[PDB]
Amino acid sequence: EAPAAVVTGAAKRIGRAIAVKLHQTGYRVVIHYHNSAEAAVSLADELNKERSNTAVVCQADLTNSNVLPASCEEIINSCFRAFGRCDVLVNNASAFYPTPLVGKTVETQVAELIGTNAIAPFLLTMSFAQRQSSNLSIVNLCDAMVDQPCMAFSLYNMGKHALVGLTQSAALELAPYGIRVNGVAPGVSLLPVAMGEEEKDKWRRKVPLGRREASAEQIADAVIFLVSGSAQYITGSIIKVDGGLSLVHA
Amino acid sequence: EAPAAVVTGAAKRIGRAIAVKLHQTGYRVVIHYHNSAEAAVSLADELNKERSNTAVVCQADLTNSNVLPASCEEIINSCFRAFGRCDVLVNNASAFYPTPLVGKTVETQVAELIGTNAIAPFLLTMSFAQRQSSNLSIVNLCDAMVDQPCMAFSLYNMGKHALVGLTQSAALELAPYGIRVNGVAPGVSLLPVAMGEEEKDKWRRKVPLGRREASAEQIADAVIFLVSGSAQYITGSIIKVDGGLSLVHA
Amino acid sequence: EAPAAVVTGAAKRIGRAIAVKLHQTGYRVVIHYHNSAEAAVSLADELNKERSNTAVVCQADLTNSNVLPASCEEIINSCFRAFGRCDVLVNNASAFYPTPLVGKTVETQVAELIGTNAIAPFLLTMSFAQRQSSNLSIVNLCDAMVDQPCMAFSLYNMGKHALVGLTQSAALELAPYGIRVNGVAPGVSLLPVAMGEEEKDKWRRKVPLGRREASAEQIADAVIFLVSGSAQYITGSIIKVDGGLSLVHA
Amino acid sequence: EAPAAVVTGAAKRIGRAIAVKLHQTGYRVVIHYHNSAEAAVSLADELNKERSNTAVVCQADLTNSNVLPASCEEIINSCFRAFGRCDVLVNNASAFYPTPLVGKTVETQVAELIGTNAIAPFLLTMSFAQRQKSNLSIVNLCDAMVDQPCMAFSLYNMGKHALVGLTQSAALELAPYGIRVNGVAPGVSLLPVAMGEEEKDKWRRKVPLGRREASAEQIADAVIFLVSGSAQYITGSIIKVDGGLSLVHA
Ligand SMILES: NC(=O)c1ccc[n+]([C@@H]2O[C@H](COP(=O)([O-])OP(=O)(O)OC[C@H]3O[C@@H](n4cnc5c(N)ncnc54)[C@H](OP(=O)(O)O)[C@@H]3O)[C@@H](O)[C@H]2O)c1
Ligand SMILES: NC(=O)c1ccc[n+]([C@@H]2O[C@H](COP(=O)([O-])OP(=O)(O)OC[C@H]3O[C@@H](n4cnc5c(N)ncnc54)[C@H](OP(=O)(O)O)[C@@H]3O)[C@@H](O)[C@H]2O)c1
Ligand SMILES: NC(=O)c1ccc[n+]([C@@H]2O[C@H](COP(=O)([O-])OP(=O)(O)OC[C@H]3O[C@@H](n4cnc5c(N)ncnc54)[C@H](OP(=O)(O)O)[C@@H]3O)[C@@H](O)[C@H]2O)c1
Ligand SMILES: NC(=O)c1ccc[n+]([C@@H]2O[C@H](COP(=O)([O-])OP(=O)(O)OC[C@H]3O[C@@H](n4cnc5c(N)ncnc54)[C@H](OP(=O)(O)O)[C@@H]3O)[C@@H](O)[C@H]2O)c1
Ligand SMILES: Nc1nc(N)c2c(-c3ccccc3)c(-c3ccccc3)[nH]c2n1
Ligand SMILES: Nc1nc(N)c2c(-c3ccccc3)c(-c3ccccc3)[nH]c2n1
Ligand SMILES: Nc1nc(N)c2c(-c3ccccc3)c(-c3ccccc3)[nH]c2n1
Ligand SMILES: Nc1nc(N)c2c(-c3ccccc3)c(-c3ccccc3)[nH]c2n1
DSSP, X not given: OOOEEXXXXXXXXXXXXXXXXXXXXXXXXXXXXXXOHHHXXXXXXXXXXXXXXXXXXXXXXXXXXXXXXXXXXXXXXXXXXXXXXXXXXXXOOOOOOOOOOOXXXXXXXXXXXXXXXXXXXXXXXXXXXXXXXXXXXXXXXXOTTTTSOOTTOHHHHHHHXXXXXXXXXXXXXXXXXXXXXXXXXXXXXXXXXXSOHHHHHHHHTTOTTTSSOOOHHHHHHHHHHHXXXXXXXXXXOEEEESTTGGGOOO | OOOEEEETTOSSHHHXXXXXXXXXXXXXXXXXXXXXXXXXXXXXXXXXXXXXXOEEEEEOOOSOSTTHHHHHHHHHHHHHHHHSOOOEEEEOOOOOOOOOOOOOOHHHHHHHHHIIIIIHHXXXXXXXXXXXXXXXXXXXXXXXTTTSOOTTOHHHHHHHHHHHHHHHHHHHHHGGGTOEEEXXXXXXXXXXXXXXXXXHHHHHHHOTTTSSOBOHHHHHHHHHHHHSGGGTTOOSOEEEESTTGGGOOO | OOOEXXXXXXXXXXXXXXXXXXHHTTOEEEEEESSOXXXXXXXXXXXXXXXXXXXXXXXXXXXXXXXHHHHHHHHHHHHHHHHSOOOEEEEOOOOOOOOOOOOOOHHHHHHHHHIIIIIHHHHHHHHHHHHOOOOEEEEEEOOTTTTSOOTTOHHHHHHHHHHHHHHHHHHHHHGGGXXXXXXXXXXXXXXXXXXXHHHHHHHHTTOTTTSOOXXXXXXXXXXXXXXXXXXXXXXXXEEEESTTGGGOOO | OOOEEEETTOSSHHHHHHHHHHHHTTOEEEEEESSOHHHXXXXXXXXXXXXXXXXXXXXXXXXXXXXXXXXXXXXXXXXXXXXXXXOEEEEOOOOOOOOOXXXXXXXXXXXXXXXXXXXXXXHHHHHHHHHHOOOOEEEEEOOTTTTSOOTTOHHHHHHXXXXXXXXXXXXXXXXXXXXXXXXXXXXXXXXXXXXXXXXXHHHHTTOTTTSSOBOXXXXXXXXXXXXXXXXXXXXXXXXXXXXXXXXXXX
16 A cells, blocks of 8 residues: 655645655655645646546645644644555745844734744644654755845744754654654755846855756655655754755855 | 843743843843742842842733734833833743643643744844844843753744744844844753752763753853853854753763 | 766775665775775675676775875775776775773874874865766765764764865865765664674664664665765755764753 | 963964953963964063063974874973963964865875864863863864855865864863863954955955954953853853854855
8 A cells, every 4th residue: 555645835846846756656645735726736636647546635724823733633634534544744835035123914924934834844743643664754844044044034044943943853752653754955946937037046156066956856856865765764864955055155 | 321131031040140140240120020920029129229220020921922022012112111221132031841742732832832932032032123332132042952852842942943043043134233142052050949859860960060050140151241242243152051961972 | 887986994884885785776886995805805706796897995094194195096096997987985984992081192093083084085085076967976974973972082073073074165165066075974873793782782772763773774875865866966965864863862 | 379371373363362361361371383483472571571470482383293292292281381280271273274175285284284273172182181180171263164164175174173073072071070171163353464455355244243353352252251260161162253154145
């Protein structure tokens, strides 16, 4: 019987690339999404054409709130409902925007940035563990630049640092259950179409390895390694996939 | 005119030592507290008996909620209303208890642990910066053991990692205003007197330097250095005060 | 045609497992060794029996001295002599023994521990670089416990820290050549066969994931990943393969 | 009776500033130097004019070699011979020049960069500890930028990483003797007066806190803190004194 994986924020970009690689490797997938309903269903369709009844969608807001634990529990539940098991959780969904210290209220900024980058991963990790020759693991999408943060992104950066802490704490606590918990830390990966090509090229020129951003596939390759039998002794590790960006001084 | 400082969780233990030592150095202090009202007031009395009009109290819950930004704005405002300035912020208040992955609801555990240790510090930082020759700084009480966390303390450890992120991010962002942002990271300090003799001895025996915990005053000494004119180029630094504990393998 | 790899200290234990996996993946290998001539010759024989003239041996002391640069240059030369190319360098050889601060002279201890763990890697890196679809990379065998070092192993730990610095520096500097430079950081692996099982068990008991040391093959799996086409944007990254050991407090 | 300190590379720049501040604090000092004889003697003269019999010079090359351990032993011995005690060691002396991977021989580059920055500190630390076999401590001058190194400075960076390892290993091992071991990590400080102005300003512009380099006295300030009675529980800590430089992404 095929194993199953939940990928958060999997309608597009890096999360989709990860869901696709897992599905190709043989996983059944839960494609979680928030607003990108069309994209999520379109991916589920593609994947189901390849192999029937191997993909489902699950909509959830991962903003912090008093019902977030319920939402996270329901994401894990949807994998068990659809596939009878949940082997892998990938925490990929992430809000990202500036929150300067000097339209959204600060309450909202705190809830969205901390919720998606840290608290939801924690609550998904709880639910994944509680609901349990298998190879169970969790992969967190971290950030290679967490110690050299973008100006005015404090809440986003706090969230990513907390996700490091969770990766470590959960690796330690879930080790007795056979559940490995690791991370992948992109540098600069999929640049948005809508960026001034002046601005995209400015990020690209910063990367020592090729003067280019990582492809989604390159990030997903590291995820697939960590979930593989080739990483059976690896837990609490964060693999940077940054082309050396984080090594470059100002 | 004397500079003024806000110390959160200052009614006892390490926060009290930090308030006392700042006061001894010449600061006027706002004693923030949550439940320890009698000890907060008694400290204020003692400090005011020493120099008139140099200490006030400000009560607030720093649990995460939709009213926390206002609570944090009021803590900073209390310094201005009393003393007409606010030169130093010390983020010391902290909830600490286990939150296993497998009475409080999980949403309360998240609000308390992430609120006190990370979000409140962030909102207090926003309010402090927004209100601003001078020697302005912020000191965050971090944790020397953040990469080797206690078993079953994921949320606390998440909060403390986030606080590292805030320290770095706010140092970078506030440096143009001349506001330094640093941290002090205790190991083990002030073991609860009701913790077991076996359990205390076990922690003490692990500390390389002197096989004993730090006094509150030793933690406060590092805070004082960071706020002083002897640390005028220091920003985004976290000083461990741990007797070498974090260096000891399992 | 087939790529070629140099593995230092490859006659036994982890280095041998690395050379065998590389070979199995289709690499031709230089098997470098120092004292273990029988094991190195025998390993080359076994691999050549599998595919004709796909392995060679090369002896060299990698102790620091005035002839170490020529020695290292000759190891890289030996790969080109045998195979006309050198795509991968794995810095695995390592002296490991205590050097207390309070029958070898201290200058010999310095020379062996810093030579094998850092200086020889740097010199090999230079010679490798100087000689250069393509997929070139270096993997350095680091140590997951470098920040929580064994008591009285200062010189070893200094060497391993130096090796981290080389991994970063060389990743930055060799990126323009498309040479990636990464590390693998074992926790406890392949405990000495001669170590009593009861001492083996003291280390084993520390490991959260499975209360077991890593196999040589598990270490080798991380090396294989890093040299593979699935790691082509990864440079300056150190992958811990430690079962959570470095996460455990004293 | 006054305590005594050895400061290596103390004739000029940051070491000189550290020796001066230690002397103003009440220490007698050994001013170690290599080539800057006139500067060293001029400094000793000036400190002795302030307090008779409180400063000596000690010449030694700290390049790695088979006699480096005897040279390091003689430096420590010079302090006991002049003052009858040695309370503080500051490892400040440092060779700094590029060593690219692709007039000095490489043997010499290795001996100078690894000797001065790492091996001499280790040997001096041994001789220090053995002569003690009060508030005894060691301060190592580290580098805030060691994870974002200068292009083509691999050996210097390996040296400085090794020095972090020494700081940690020695703090752990010397703690039972009451000897604390810490570091101060400058970012950019005291630019060579002769460095081109455009290059000076290129570095200055990078620093968030004031867009300027640290003064030598600001670096000394943090050394003075670490040797003081206000840092009695601090060991194995490295204090960055960098104006936020290390926080800035490429
Ligand atoms: N791209 C990079 O260069 C880079 C760099 C560093 C780290 N990373 C990390 O790698 C991961 C993937 O990066 P990316 O660029 O692919 O991510 P992204 O496009 O910015 O976001 C991924 C998904 O997060 C989901 N999301 C956003 N807010 C949400 C909310 N409130 N509730 C639930 N889901 C929400 C969105 O789902 P819908 O579209 O369905 O609404 C979005 O498609 C992230 O964790 C990111 O931080 C990426
Ligand atoms: N003690 C150690 O060994 C150690 C180790 C690592 C880090 N630290 C850090 O050093 C700092 C001080 O340590 P500590 O042991 O002195 O702290 P603590 O005694 O555990 O807590 C300090 C204060 O935090 C306040 N607090 C708790 N929950 C709160 C809430 N919901 N809202 C507002 N305030 C709240 C409490 O105020 P009331 O008493 O007024 O309710 C309490 O007095 C903390 O940040 C801690 O994490 C300490
Ligand atoms: N085993 C662990 O748990 C562990 C933990 C952390 C890091 N690591 C690292 O992973 C790598 C492999 O570990 P291991 O346990 O397999 O290593 P090892 O058996 O201790 O050493 C590997 C080889 O290093 C070679 N070597 C030693 N001194 C040398 C010298 N002066 N010149 C040239 N070669 C020399 C030896 O070659 P000959 O036998 O031919 O003389 C030896 O077989 C090492 O870098 C090690 O530090 C291992
Ligand atoms: N300046 C900065 O911005 C900066 C940045 C990061 C770290 N640091 C660290 O802070 C410390 C002081 O920096 P600095 O700029 O003042 O240092 P520096 O001027 O570059 O070097 C200090 C002294 O090192 C001594 N030295 C060099 N080679 C030697 C050898 N082979 N044997 C013995 N002594 C030798 C020299 O003594 P003689 O003059 O007597 O020959 C020199 O005066 C160093 O450890 C440095 O790495 C400085
Ligand atoms: N959820 C999410 N989405 C993103 N698009 C990013 C990015 C990012 C930022 C700039 C260019 C490309 C990607 C980054 C990022 C952060 C710091 C440095 C580089 C990229 N983090 C992101 N997280
Ligand atoms: N707010 C708060 N209060 C505390 N009492 C602690 C402690 C702590 C944990 C054990 C003994 C003494 C102190 C710790 C702690 C955490 C990790 C390792 C060691 C101590 N953190 C704390 N935070
Ligand atoms: N070259 C070499 N050989 C080794 N055998 C080791 C070890 C080591 C240490 C203890 C048990 C097994 C292996 C370790 C090691 C170091 C620090 C913590 C744990 C293991 N490093 C080694 N390096
Ligand atoms: N012994 C020694 N001397 C030095 N002059 C430096 C410097 C340095 C590099 C550039 C400007 C000013 C100082 C640096 C340095 C290194 C990396 C980043 C920034 C400064 N390290 C030094 N070490």
